[PDB]
Design a protein around this nucleic acid. Structure first.
Ligand SMILES: Nc1ncnc2c1ncn2[C@@H]1O[C@H](COS(=O)(=O)NC(=O)[C@@H](N)Cc2ccc(O)cc2)[C@@H](O)[C@H]1O
Length: 426
RNA sequence: GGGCAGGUUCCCGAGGGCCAAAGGGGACGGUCUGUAAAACCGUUGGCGUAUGCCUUCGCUGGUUCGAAUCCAGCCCUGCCCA
């Protein structure tokens, strides 16, 4: 029911604005058009994206239509939201290549039934947008209004260059809302301004101003910055279960609550239970939930206590029942425990080394780590040895000049958890 | 178009030979640890293993035995001017 729908949607949301409009729209008893755009500046989605995407999923389950806009054209312009410097240039070919991963992976969270979902690339309409149209859009706002954004304010005062093209971006995003007659636009808090310009431009085109639905930003593994591909602080949605699990175990403790609120549906009471049980046991449940969820082709409608138990775990164990749970998660958790103990994991990548790479029937340890893809350079492999960062067959290397014999397979290790098995091939 | 300050590696930065370039950040490796934080000790162009070479100091040319350094023109940014 209208009143009870808004209740669900509100949970987790930073702010809906204006709320009174969302209520009105829900009462119209019809499928609302729900806009989420994403610029594929780099490939692959992450749990950060899942924050907004999973709220889109919640809209779909209440029978509303999600429009996923692939920003192939905006992508080339570059969104200045949250940016300390002009985004480096990007071509339409590059953004279109990247967009494949977005379209593929968005399915893991979104329902794909035509009535619930539509896919569009904004280049469809933006490419043929005319100079006259651009003049009309850019007449809707003033300089002082643009420089009142935190981004440009800081950049302008501190004397950091701002390219004029950066001033166009919001109008492109706003026009998208017109092009699809958006009832609701979804975004993280970093998208506030673009969403608000969406309301301006819609009004100017004699449409109803969309509801601006703002979610909180998921902080990355570094512990401060927002999860982003570029900051290399992310957990990708299509990472192997082993990898998602270990990464979720490394989430800084202060972030745990937000991770539970933004990424799962556990009631506030259930969260505080887990936190009481302690940091490590909390991590285990988080890791299990999400690794399980994203291991599936598509996540369930809810990631809740009921989902946890349907896996094989028991809530009251509070992350002790390590034996329980499905296969991909169990072997993922096993690996984590095994590596934590200072052991070699069961399944490791094998890499064959052509015999031509040998010199006098052996290979320098440094080159071997490079060939194996564990070090970017030989110089780096030596310095990693100086810092006791490399292991051969379980034993910490100390001889940067070691000559390795590949008569039989050897296990190379870099740092705590990167392992390759190497062997010869004629 | 015309002044002045600035352009250095992933970022910010210090700067006639011994400068692959101080220091700081970030990242990486290690100890402690819970594959957390924090603290602490290291590392931070590349090359089969280097008194050798290549890549990196905005560009191009010049000077000098030798240029990140000095010079000339030129591309770019900020502040000032028009
Ligand atoms: N770590 C994170 N936590 C929470 N939300 C996150 C996040 N990282 C990204 N997001 C959200 O995921 C969405 C996609 O991010 S993004 O690709 O950088 N978005 C943008 O650049 C938008 N300007 C894309 C766009 C929007 C609308 C359009 O009509 C066209 C394009 C945004 O709503 C963003 O807020």
């Amino acid at each position: 029911t209208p009143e009870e729908a808004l209740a669900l949607l509100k949970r987790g949301a930073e702010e809906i604005v204006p709320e009174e409009e969302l209520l009105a729209k829900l009462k119209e008893g019809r499928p609302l058009t729900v806009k989420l755009g994403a610029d594929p500046t780099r490939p692959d989605l992450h749990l950060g994206h899942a924050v907004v995407l999973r709220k889109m999923r919640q809209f779909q389950e209440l029978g509303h239509k999600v429009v996923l806009i692939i920003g192939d054209f905006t992508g080339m312009i570059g969104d200045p939201s949250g940016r300390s410097k002009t985004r480096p240039p990007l071509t339409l070919e590059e953004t279109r290549e990247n967009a494949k991963t977005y379209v593929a992976q968005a399915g893991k969270i979104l329902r794909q039934e035509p009535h619930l979902f539509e896919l569009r690339y904004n280049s469809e309409w933006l490419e043929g947008l005319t100079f006259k149209e651009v003049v009309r859009l850019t007449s809707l706002m003033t300089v002082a209004q643009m420089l009142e954004r935190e981004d440009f304010k800081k950049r302008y005062e501190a004397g950091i260059p701002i390219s004029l093209h950066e001033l166009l971006y919001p109008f492109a995003q706003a026009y998208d809302s017109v092009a699809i007659r958006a009832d609701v636009e979804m975004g993280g808090t970093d998208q506030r301004f673009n969403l608000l310009v969406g309301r301006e431009v819609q009004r100017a085109y004699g449409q109803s101003p969309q509801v601006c639905f703002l979610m909180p930003l998921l902080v990355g593994l570094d512990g401060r910055e927002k999860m982003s591909k570029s900051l290399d602080n992310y957990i990708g949605l299509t990472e192997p279960p082993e990898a998602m699990f270990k990464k979720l175990m490394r989430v800084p403790d202060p972030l745990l609550p937000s991770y539970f609120r933004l990424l799962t549906d556990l009631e506030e009471e259930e969260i505080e239970a887990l936190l009481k049980a302690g940091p490590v046991p909390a991590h285990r449940v988080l890791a299990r939930l999400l690794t399980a969820a994203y291991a599936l082709p598509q996540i369930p409608p809810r990631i809740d206590r009921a989902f946890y138990e349907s896996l094989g775990y028991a809530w009251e164990a509070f992350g002790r029942d390590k034996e329980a749970g499905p296969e991909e998660v169990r072997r993922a958790e096993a690996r984590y425990d095994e590596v934590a103990k200072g052991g070699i994991p069961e399944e490791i990548p094998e890499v064959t080394i052509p015999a031509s790479e040998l010199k006098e029937g052996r290979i320098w340890v440094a080159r071997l780590f490079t060939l194996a893809g564990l070090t970017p350079s030989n110089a780096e492999a030596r310095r990693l040895i100086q810092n006791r960062g490399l292991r051969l067959d379980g034993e910490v290397l100390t001889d940067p000049m070691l000559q390795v014999d590949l008569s039989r397979p050897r296990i190379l290790q870099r740092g705590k958890d990167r392992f390759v098995r190497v062997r010869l091939s004629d």
